[PDB]
């Protein structure tokens, strides 16, 4: 059995459950739209590729609606149109792969009336970020009872994966298919509490974030995307304005200038 789940206004709605007469036949996903920024020099052969990018793509769901009678059919069509089309983008996922969700916007799709009570539909959701992300962030535990993780999410079956560290040198595993960069509108949060003047170094990437003031254990330093704060107060003037990024796989992190470090990473995995 196939079904489609929609996250809207903080509520999860099953498409089949919401509309009893509507059942999802099949789901499908367009392949990533790779595009190399070609540059052509006249007289030479081929192109000089720039930086490969990914265009928005389409997630499709073929379904059918079976109503009791004609007024019921029209009412169901209107209610489905009301439910699907909202002002802002929402989230969708499928039973087949319940660990991966897409932030999407609906597309105009017309009901194909086959009989007096049945109508075929092929809903298409445009995903504009160009990638899919996990339903849960890195802060969620990798436990069975959380009911969030599934197979095929590049989870390493060779070592434990935790995202809270108590020492000055450790490794963090980004399981996504893209390098997590807040400059690319990626979600990434770091919460560190320690004593002294801190400096975070990502050795594999080679990046370094530097804060130039003394810190106490009671003050939390929070880097969200491209904003560093202490106690939710912007302190960008007192930093080196550097930002760390998470490469694919393992990243070696070293923290200098502080003691009793407690650093936590909170970011979703980027799939495609």
């Amino acid at each position: 059995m196939s079904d489609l789940f929609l996250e809207l206004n903080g509520k999860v709605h099953s498409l089949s459950e919401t509309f009893p007469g509507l059942s999802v036949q099949e789901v499908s996903r367009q392949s990533p739209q790779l595009s190399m920024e070609t540059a052509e020099i006249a007289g030479t052969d081929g192109v000089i590729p720039g930086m490969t990018q990914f265009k928005p793509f389409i997630f499709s769901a073929k379904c059918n609606l079976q109503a009791l009678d004609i007024p019921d059919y029209h009412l169901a069509v209107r209610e489905i149109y009301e439910f699907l089309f909202q002002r802002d983008s929402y989230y969708i996922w499928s039973d087949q792969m319940p660990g991966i969700r897409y932030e999407v916007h609906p597309k105009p799709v017309d009901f194909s009336r086959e009989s007096d009570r049945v109508g075929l539909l092929t809903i298409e959701f445009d995903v504009f970020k160009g990638y899919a992300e996990s339903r849960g962030t890195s802060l969620d535990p990798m436990t069975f009872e959380v009911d969030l993780w599934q197979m095929g999410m590049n989870l390493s079956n060779r070592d434990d994966l935790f995202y809270v560290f108590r020492e000055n040198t450790f490794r963090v595993y980004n399981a996504g298919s893209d390098r997590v960069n807040p400059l690319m509108r990626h979600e990434l949060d770091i919460a560190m509490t320690a004593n002294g003047t801190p400096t975070i170094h990502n050795l594999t990437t080679g990046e370094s974030f530097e804060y130039r003031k003394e810190l106490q254990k009671t003050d939390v330093l929070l880097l969200n995307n491209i904003y560093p704060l202490v106690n939710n107060r912007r302190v960008g003037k007192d930093t080196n304005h550097g930002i760390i990024t998470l490469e694919k796989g393992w990243n070696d992190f070293e923290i200098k200038g502080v003691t009793d470090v407690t650093i936590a990473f909170n970011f979703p995995f980027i799939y495609r």
């Binding site: 020099i41 006249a42 007289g43 030479t44």
Partner: protein, 126 residues
Amino acid sequence: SYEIQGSFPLVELEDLGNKNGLELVNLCLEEFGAILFADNKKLYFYDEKSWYVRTEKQFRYLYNTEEVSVDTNTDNLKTEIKCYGKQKENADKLTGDNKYMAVVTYTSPNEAIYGKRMANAKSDDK
């Protein structure tokens, strides 16, 4: 703050001042033939010798260049000029080039490639 790196000649000027900083900097660049480059708020003034630095990087056709354009103009191609110096006190009493103690005609060697192309006379009274 300003720094100077190079050698520049002496220039005679009249009633220097009564201008903003940028106007005086532009005057220096135009007169002394300097090149200005700023490290934020610190202005370095070089000369032609100390400004350009030779590098091994090169521009090659069909390798790293796409469109190359050359604009050539010869509307002001002049190889001869006549100039007059200051004016004598008895200018009204004198006739012709005798009105000036300094009258000179300069002919460039490039005339041998272009012939005589004399321009309108320029007068310096100093």
